[PDB]
Amino acid sequence: SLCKIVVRREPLDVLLPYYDASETTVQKILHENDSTLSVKFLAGVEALIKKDELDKYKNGKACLRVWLKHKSGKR
Amino acid sequence: MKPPFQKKSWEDLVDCVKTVQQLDNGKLIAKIKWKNGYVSTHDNIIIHQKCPLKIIEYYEAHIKFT
Amino acid sequence: MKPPFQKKSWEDLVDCVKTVQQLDNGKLIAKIKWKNGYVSTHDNIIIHQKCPLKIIEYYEAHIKFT
């Protein structure tokens, strides 16, 4: 008996006018945790983010790109 | 009024999560109602860090078993 | 190997929530896989206290927009 969370779709402009798009600007990668990276966001929150989901956040793709170059020794 | 990021927890200041929706890039965002009447919308990762028990309450209010 | 019920957080010890199910009486229970490969079952109320981010991860993996 599978479990699911069933949410009625709403137009995004019910939500977005009250959304500060700057909050989750990625500022830096702080450390690793298994496959994830601990990141500092501009709003002043730290969180574990999956590497393949960093591109969902402002500056996440760019930050990951540089981190990968340092991690691999190309920088 | 700006969300108070200087506070480690928002559990006591938030009334409820009103809805969670999905952006085109697949990220989830959540609209929250504060106890003081204000509303704000955040990436879900923010809500996970500031008031996870409110979003758990919201998800469990929408749970369905097959 | 018993769960560390005295420890305030289990986030670092748990791999994932595998399932949430509802017992006849209505209670929700969560089956969790620990990072050591063991599995145990707990009232959701306990999981909210111990590893809320893990149950959030599970719920967000099973959101369906209608």
Residue numbers in the entry:
A (entry chain C): 7 to 81
B (entry chain A), C (entry chain B): 315 to 380
Study authors write:
In fission yeast, the two HP1 proteins Chp2 and Swi6 assume distinct roles and Chp2 is tightly associated with the nucleosome remodeling and deacetylation complex SHREC. Here we show that Chp2 binds the N terminus of Mit1, and that an extensive interface between Chp2 and Mit1 provides a high-affinity interaction that is required for recruitment of Mit1 to heterochromatin and silencing of gene expression.
Limited proteolysis of a complex consisting of the Chp2CSD and the N-terminal 300 residues of Mit1 revealed a protected Mit1 fragment corresponding to residues 1–81, which we will refer to as the Chp2 interaction interface (CII). This Mit1 fragment formed a stable complex with Chp2, which readily crystallized and allowed us to determine the structure by molecular replacement at a resolution of 1.6 Å. The structure of this minimal Chp2–Mit1 complex revealed a 2:1 stoichiometry with one Mit1 molecule bound to one Chp2CSD dimer. Mit1CII occupies the canonical peptide-binding groove at the CSD dimerization interface and, intriguingly, it wraps around one of the Chp2CSDs and engages an extensive interaction interface. The structure allows for the unambiguous identification of residues 9–13 of Mit1 in the CSD dimerization grove. These residues correspond to the sequence CKIVV with I11 occupying the center position on the symmetry axis of the CSD dimer. The central I11 is a large hydrophobic side chain, and when compared to HP1-CAF1, a canonical HP1-PxVxL complex, Chp2 accommodates the extra bulk of the isoleucine by a side chain rotation of Y373 such that the aromatic face of the tyrosine residue packs against the methyl groups of I11. The linker region is followed by a folded domain, easily recognizable as a CD fold with close resemblance to the Chp1 CD. However, the Mit1 CD-like (CDL) domain lacks an aromatic cage and the binding groove for a methyl-lysine histone peptide. The Chp2–Mit1 structure reveals an extensive interface that buries 3354 Å2 of surface area involving the CkIvV motif, linker region and CDL domain (CkIvV motif: 1465 Å2, Linker: 1131 Å2, CDL: 750 Å2). We also observe a molecule of hexanediol that is deeply buried by the Chp2 N terminus, and we speculate that it substitutes for one or two N-terminal residues by which our CSD construct is too short.
